[PDB]
Amino acid sequence: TKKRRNNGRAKKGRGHVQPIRCTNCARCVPKDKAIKKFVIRNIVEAAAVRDISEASVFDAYVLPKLYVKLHYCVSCAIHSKVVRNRSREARKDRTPPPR
């Protein structure tokens, strides 16, 4: 039987979307199917921010960011616990988890 109303992907008005590669194992995934995760993790690891900033040659130096857009196949995103399985009524819910 059919499990989701879209077929686990966001392809509605087109026939073929181009594929990307999973950043964890390089599986070919269509672009709309893949679990996208944009991370703006700081490059400093704030346990270390009070050591880099005291050792700087500046005083007001805002530390840069790191902009990585990760992609995942369904196999890797479950195994990395990016996503989880949900109940049957709780699948019908598209609001992202809060911050």
Binding site for Zn ion (CB under 5 A): 22, 24-25, 27, 73, 76
# residues contacting RNA (CB under 7 A): 32
42 belongs to the binding site for RNA (CB under 7 A): no
Q: Give the distance, in angstroms, between the CA of residue 8 and the centroid of all CA atoms in the same chain.
A: 16
Helical spans, DSSP H, in the chain: 49-52, 74-79
- Give min distance, CB of 90 to RNA, in A: 12
Residue 78 to residue 84: CA distance in whole angstroms: 6
68 belongs to the binding site for RNA (CB under 7 A): no
Say how many residues make up the chain: 99
- Give min distance, CB of 45 to RNA, in A: 20
The nearer residue to RNA, 50 or 86, going by C-beta atoms, is 86
Residue 68 to residue 76: CA distance in whole angstroms: 17
99 belongs to the binding site for RNA (CB under 7 A): no
